[PDB]
Symmetry: C7
Amino acid sequence: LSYAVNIVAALAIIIVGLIIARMISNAVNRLMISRKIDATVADFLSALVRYGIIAFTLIAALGRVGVQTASVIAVLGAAGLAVGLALQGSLSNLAAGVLLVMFRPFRAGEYVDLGGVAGTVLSVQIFSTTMRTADGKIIVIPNGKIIAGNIINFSREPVRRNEFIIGVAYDSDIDQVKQILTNIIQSEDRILKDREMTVRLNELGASSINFVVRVWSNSGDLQNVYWDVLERIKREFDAAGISFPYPQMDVNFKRV
Amino acid sequence: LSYAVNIVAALAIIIVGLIIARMISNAVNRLMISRKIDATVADFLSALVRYGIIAFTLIAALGRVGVQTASVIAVLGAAGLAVGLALQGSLSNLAAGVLLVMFRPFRAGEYVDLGGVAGTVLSVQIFSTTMRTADGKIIVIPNGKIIAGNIINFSREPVRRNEFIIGVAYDSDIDQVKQILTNIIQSEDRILKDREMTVRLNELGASSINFVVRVWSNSGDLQNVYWDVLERIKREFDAAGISFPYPQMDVNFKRV
Amino acid sequence: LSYAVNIVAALAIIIVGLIIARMISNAVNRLMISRKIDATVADFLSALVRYGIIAFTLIAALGRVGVQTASVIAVLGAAGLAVGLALQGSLSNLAAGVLLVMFRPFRAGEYVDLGGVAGTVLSVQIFSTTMRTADGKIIVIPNGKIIAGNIINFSREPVRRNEFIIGVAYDSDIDQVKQILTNIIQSEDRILKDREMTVRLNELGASSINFVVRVWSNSGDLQNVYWDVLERIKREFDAAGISFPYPQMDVNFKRV
Amino acid sequence: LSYAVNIVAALAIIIVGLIIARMISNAVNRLMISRKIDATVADFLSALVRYGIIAFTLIAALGRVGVQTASVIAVLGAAGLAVGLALQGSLSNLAAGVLLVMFRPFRAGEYVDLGGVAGTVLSVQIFSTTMRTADGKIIVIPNGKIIAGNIINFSREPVRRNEFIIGVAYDSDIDQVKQILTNIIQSEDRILKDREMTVRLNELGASSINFVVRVWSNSGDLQNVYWDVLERIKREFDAAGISFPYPQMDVNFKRV
Amino acid sequence: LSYAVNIVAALAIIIVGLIIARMISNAVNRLMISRKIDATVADFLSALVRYGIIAFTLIAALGRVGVQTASVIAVLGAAGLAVGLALQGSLSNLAAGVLLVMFRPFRAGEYVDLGGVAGTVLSVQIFSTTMRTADGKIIVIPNGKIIAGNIINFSREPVRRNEFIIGVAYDSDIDQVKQILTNIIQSEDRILKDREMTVRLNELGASSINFVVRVWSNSGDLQNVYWDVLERIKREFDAAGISFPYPQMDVNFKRV
Amino acid sequence: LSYAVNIVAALAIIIVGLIIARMISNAVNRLMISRKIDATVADFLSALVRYGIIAFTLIAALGRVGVQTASVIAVLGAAGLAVGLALQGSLSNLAAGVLLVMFRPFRAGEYVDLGGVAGTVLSVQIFSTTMRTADGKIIVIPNGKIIAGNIINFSREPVRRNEFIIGVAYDSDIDQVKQILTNIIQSEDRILKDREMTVRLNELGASSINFVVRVWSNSGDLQNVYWDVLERIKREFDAAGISFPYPQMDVNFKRV
Amino acid sequence: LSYAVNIVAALAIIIVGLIIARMISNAVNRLMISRKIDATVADFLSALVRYGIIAFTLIAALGRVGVQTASVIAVLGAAGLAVGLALQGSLSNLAAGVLLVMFRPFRAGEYVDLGGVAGTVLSVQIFSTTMRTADGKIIVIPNGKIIAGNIINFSREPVRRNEFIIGVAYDSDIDQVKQILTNIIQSEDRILKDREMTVRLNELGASSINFVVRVWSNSGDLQNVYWDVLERIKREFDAAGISFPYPQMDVNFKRV
């Protein structure tokens, strides 16, 4: 009767608002992904302008039922903070996923350590990056946790350093051990000779002397250099009388 | 007398506001779940438009009792931030449950590890996903904790890697152990031969040499490959003189 | 004199505001708890509409003393954020207690583990659920901590899995132990035979081999199956020569 | 001259504002503590209406010096958020102290454990509850920490459960130990016989079998039942040949 | 020329604003510290009214240069939230220092434990209380950390409880130990005889029986009662054949 | 044409706004650092009034291009909260650095412990204090972490207390040890004799009696008193038959 | 028809708004990076003025379609808080990266320890600094974590202190050890003689006396001084009869 004759006009204005929403959203999506910025930020601005002009046609619509503008924008601001505080941690991930592609602390296919978990990065999606670990698991890390912590890129510099700690007995000859561990890493072929090769006495432990051996090698064959120097240490120390010691004790008897 | 004759009109306007609230809410619920988006986001927008036009008819109603618009929207904004800060963590879960179905880091029936707790995902509800652990417990995790942490999907890639660490004595022959642990995993049928099969000296421990054996196999029979290679290691090491060592000590007597 | 003649009208308007506050609050309380929703949310909306129309009659009252509307709503918005930030954690519990009855991750009388503390849920009150632990203590957990953490419902699925870890000596026969621990759990009557019954070599520990035995049984008699299989393991291993080992050592003498 | 002749009127309006502030504050304090609610919430609303009508007379006063209303409410809103964010954690404690008396998870004189610290509650003040521990210390816990954590009310249910864990040697007779620990707790008079009395094999430890004995008794004499069953266990096990074992070892000699 | 002739009037209005700021600030400081409240809250309200009427004369001043009120209060609200979010943790300490003097969980010169750190309180300043520890260090704790944690007032109740745990050997006579530890604390003069004096078997440890002895004494001479009962325990146990045991072991030889 | 003829006036108004910004900022900087407050707070108010009247001339400028005031202050309030939430933790440090110079819990050149890290304070800058540790490292701590944690000023009181814990054997004479450790600290010259000198039996440990010796000395020579009393303890205990004990054991043989 | 004839004018106004946005943004970028401040803050103000006058031309544009200003600024304020709470942790890093170059707690190429991770700083980018560790890894730390924690600049002061802890046996001569460890560090050439050289008895440990030796040397050759004094300690102690002790025990036999 007296009410519905404006409700039909409100439905017409809201359906042409939906039409112009799809039109302007797809227009700015077609323009921005080709002109300047990105395929990800432009979709965010497309959704922003889409749900912005939806809000504009809602404010224009709800005046036709008598509801004033200062009340419509109050209810829309309440609903806007409702959906905005729903999407706080859902949009911090998007804003971080922009920075992870714009600045690239890691590329796809690069062994990283994103705060405890270490693996090859498969892809950086919109909200969360997928990495595959060393043992075949798939770890999906949200972008708000990557950008708010350290990113230990294991595979961006070509040379990396091993660190063997060889515990020998206290009665061994330090010159003989420092000569044997030198003659191992002087004949190893993948250990870089133009960098810092150290075989020096690291510490005097509880039951063993700890020598430290730190050698540099290319990041592809780091683990093979570790496994081939350690096995050769185990071979050349038994053939030379050096004894890896057990956890020694010094028991004093009191046969009461 | 002078007051109630507008209160009856306010009750009529609020009851037709309830009627039009149910009408528009069920209309957008009928339209949106069929046209574009989702069964979950559309119910959220249904509740939003429902408690939005309830607020609109309240603002239209409370002017009939003399209360102005700028005071009604102030009290309604206070009540709106009250109910909104009541529903902060009650709506972050809904916004995360949208992303867990839209992007799917896990499907139903897939062994995951959602930050410490590991189990098969049964279903993803509106606010909280139910998983069943390995031992029959039912763990209900809210969606705000899933999307704000790692999601270790144990069952999305078909191949996974075991890691045995076999400690042998120091006097054993490293060639014999590296031949026996090779001849075990060369004859095992479910271990993938086209991938990285390593039997190399991992470390020189305190009382034992630790060999590492890392083999790849399909994610269904990973645990059976573990339990059948470990039992065969225990069988083939006793039949070959290799000795798993006890926690050795090196007691020096001082019979005072 | 010139001031109090409006103060009496302000007191009359505020006392009829209290009267209409009780009237409308009890009216919506009488309507909503019977029609649609809940006994808990409807009391919240009753308090909201009560302290909303108290605020409306305060705004209508304080114009009679000359104070304008834009100042009254400013002081009322300050007081509203004061009482609202007083009731942040006092209302997050109410909004979570709505979800704990609407979605029911636990019912009353069901053994749960609400993040570290495990017990039978007695009741879910408005702000905090009471559970009784295994040892008679009464733990009152606020609802903001239940819904923001895992809910390990120990008693919603009927079948659950035990896990015995039996450490035997290294010189024992693995076939004999895998036959004895099979013949125990094949003759136990409450262990479910149509599910996964595993007696396989879990690990080679420091001084003992760890067999794992994982059997499924109904959640009522899980603990009795544990206590009756473990006692029978202790009985059948002494009668068969299998020896549970002490923490072995391998002392090497050096009588200096 | 031209300025001070309004400043005297501003001082008169502010001094009558102080007078009416004391009047209305003491009036609502006299009315509310007797009529409906509480001695604590009514003082909060007294302070709220007091510093509200102080603000109203300030807004009415500062227009007499030419300063407009939209600037006075801006500076007052800035000062209001200043004092409100000063009193965030100073008012969360008051809002929690309302709930600790309205719902009573503990009464005065009741042994509780408010998140790590355990003691008898002396009183619940406005901002912080005082408890006296077992050893005479006085711990003042703020109410924001009580209501945001577990409340383990040790003394609201009358029956509670002890748990002895008795470690015996491996060569002992399990029937003899299960008969002796039954005959102790069958003759103890304060152990409730109509509840669950368990003497069953809990675990096979490293150097000892752990029996668990869990008996129910009244919460007043729980500790005396513990101290009188444990002493009788120590008496009846020496008189029966059962041996509490030392930390056993299994040293294997190698006299090199 | 055309601009500066209003700038001189703006400087005159701002210098008389500074004059009236000092006047009203010192007036309310002179009135409030003598009449009702406090020396600390009144200085806070003095600073608040001072930087409030500075803001009022700034709003009155900047209209003389053409800048409107709705822009001046916008820039002043931005600067106000800037200085307010600068002073969040700088004013929470002041609001807590009001409560630490108004309610007094500790007075000056009283041994407390304000969450980990324990010492004699020297003074409670405006923002941070100074305590002197047992070992002469000076610890300055901010008031936001005191009021948001436990306050273990070691020196507000006069009687406190010691707890000795005496480990004896397993072969000792429990009646003899319970008689000797009774005859020590029956003859000690500062141990309160009208309170709970317990010498009962606390636990059966790994290599020792632990007796617990808990006696009450005045809080001044608690440590001297500890040091004089423990020394007398060490004296009376050697004179009676009771043996404090070393960490016993139960080595089983296997001379392979 | 029709647009740029106001843009030139906008550029003239903004360049005279920059000129008056530098003028008023340097004027208040010249006035405030000499008259009342500080060299640090006055620069903050200089930056505040500078970027405030920059905002005022921007609001006056952007009306010349047709943009209204209520939109300019909306965009400026958005940008203001943007730069303000950029500078939250960048200004909490400034507000804390005001309090660290105004109240001085440490002066420059005073050994402190600002929550885990201990060193001599070099200087208190605007945002972060520099300390030099004992071992020459330079630790830059932001002021938001100093004022929100304990400040253990090691060097504000002149006397401090050592605490030696001397473990002797169980068969030693307690009178002889309490006489020797008294005769050491009675003849030491830097130990303060008018304070509390304690040599009393602290505890009966596992394999040793622990005497506690706590003596007071001036804070300059505390470490030298420690190093000279401990060396004299080691000298006077070997010359008196007291034996520092090794970690005793009580092995019971079972030659099976 | 009736609608699009204003939409073409809106597109013309928005395209000239984009043109003037690029113009004014590049103008202030060209002016500010050369005149006063920085290459980083000026780009931030360029983006701020760019997306500010984009917002101004949007507010001017959307009035041509009938939408009022108070609704356009409401939707733009909602979108502004949306993008601002997206960029909270994305702009705290920029505001911290301003302070890390303005105040410089580290320069490029300087060994630091930014809260757990220690390495040479390569560069300070806009949002995150890259450091290279000792072992060739590349760690990208966001600037919000550097400025909100300690910055242990290992390489800003030239002299640093080693700390050897030498454990010797209990029967050794303290004068001989304090003479040998003095004669080592008196003849070492890189140890600074004008600073504090300490060889004093640090502690009486469980099975060893711990001497502390703390010497100062230049920060370049600190590690070489450590490795050359420790090796000489190991050489000169075997040549002098001092014995580094094993973990001593004091076994008491009870051959039961």
